Amino acid sequence: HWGYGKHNGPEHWHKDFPIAKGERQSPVDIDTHTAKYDPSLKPLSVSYDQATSLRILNNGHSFQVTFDDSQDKAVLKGGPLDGTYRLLQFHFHWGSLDGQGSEHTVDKKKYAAELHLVHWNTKYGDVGKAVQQPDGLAVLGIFLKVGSAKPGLQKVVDVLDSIKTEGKSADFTNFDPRGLLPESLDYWTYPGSLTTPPLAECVTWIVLKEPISVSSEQVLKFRKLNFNGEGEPEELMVDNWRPAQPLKNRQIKASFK
Ligand SMILES: [N]S(=O)(=O)[C][C][C][C][C]C1234B567B89%10B%11%12%13B85%14B%1158B%12%11%15B%139%12B%1061B%12%112C5%153B%14874
Numbered sequence: 324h325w326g327y328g329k330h331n332g333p334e335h336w337h338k339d340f341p342i343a344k345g346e347r348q349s350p351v352d353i354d355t356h357t358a359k360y361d362p363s364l365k366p367l368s369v370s371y372d373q374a375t376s377l378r379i380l381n382n383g384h385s386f387q388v389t390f391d392d393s394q395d396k397a398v399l400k401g402g403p404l405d406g407t408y409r410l411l412q413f414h415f416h417w418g419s420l421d422g423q424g425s426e427h428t429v430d431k432k433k434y435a436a437e438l439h440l441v442h443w444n445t446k447y448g449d450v451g452k453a454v455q456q457p458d459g460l461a462v463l464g465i466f467l468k469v470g471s472a473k474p475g476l477q478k479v480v481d482v483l484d485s486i487k488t489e490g491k492s493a494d495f496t497n498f499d500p501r502g503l504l505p506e507s508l509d510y511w512t513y514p515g516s517l518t519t520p521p522l523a524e525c526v527t528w529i530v531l532k533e534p535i536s537v538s539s540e541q542v543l544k545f546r547k548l549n550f551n552g553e554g555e556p557e558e559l560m561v562d563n564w565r566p567a568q569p570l571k572n573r574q575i576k577a578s579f580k
């Protein structure tokens with residue numbers, strides 16, 4: 324039932340998911356001058372060389388690329404994290420125009436899109452158990468700005484016509500998510516939530532400072548996706564982002580000065 328429209332969007336979600344008004348909701352605005360440099364924060368360890376992508380899917384809210392998470396093949400460690408987090412999937416949030424689309428904001432600036440690489444803590448054994456824990460998930464967030472093309476995104480772009488409408492999926496093997504990463508792993512981190520229902524308060528957020536650039540042609544292909552199922556009235560999948568939520572009693576920490 325939930326979505327991004329006037330009658331089912333973010334301002335409505337609290338009715339089905341009352342944690343929407345909780346103490347550690349995401350996304351947030353990252354006020355760069357208030358974030359605390361923490362010299363105790365470790366470099367982030369991103370180990371994606373053995374990643375196994377499986378499928379690409381239009382789930383009615385975004386599209387996602389899903390990975391084999393039955394072994395420690397594509398893992399996030401270090402940074403603010405204790406233990407090992409397996410990559411489950413990545414997906415994006417984006418706008419109808421280039422001035423909106425990101426979930427996190429930086430000094431109130433909105434980026435054209437935001438990439439989320441979703442990982443879960445292997446100490447809980449499966450993702451469903453992990454979402455019930457305050458340290459169950461780690462989501463790596465990467466901003467997208469529009470300029471030059473990102474070559475490592477093109478394989479994704481080119482198959483989106485095959486998953487236009489909700490419920491559609493395709494094979495998507497041998498995709499290397501290292502081609503989506505910026506040069507720097509400098510980051511901000513804070514305790515938060517899933518940004519879609521069920522909005523569980525289970526996420527250590529790690530938001531990279533450096534955006535990636537994608538081309539206008541690449542993001543325009545995102546905007547040709549449909550929220551609707553095949554044959555239903557066509558509603559472009561655009562503006563699938565939750566706005567910034569109150570920071571409440573939280574500190575955003577920076578890995579860099
Ligand atoms: N924008 S975000 O990365 O915060 C939310 C992405 C959803 C994370 C993965 C889940 B799948 B299964 B259940 B469904 B719902 B619960 B469980 B796994 B997590 C989320 B969805």
Ligand SMILES: [Zn+2]
Nearest residue numbers: 414416439518
């Ligand atoms: Zn997301």
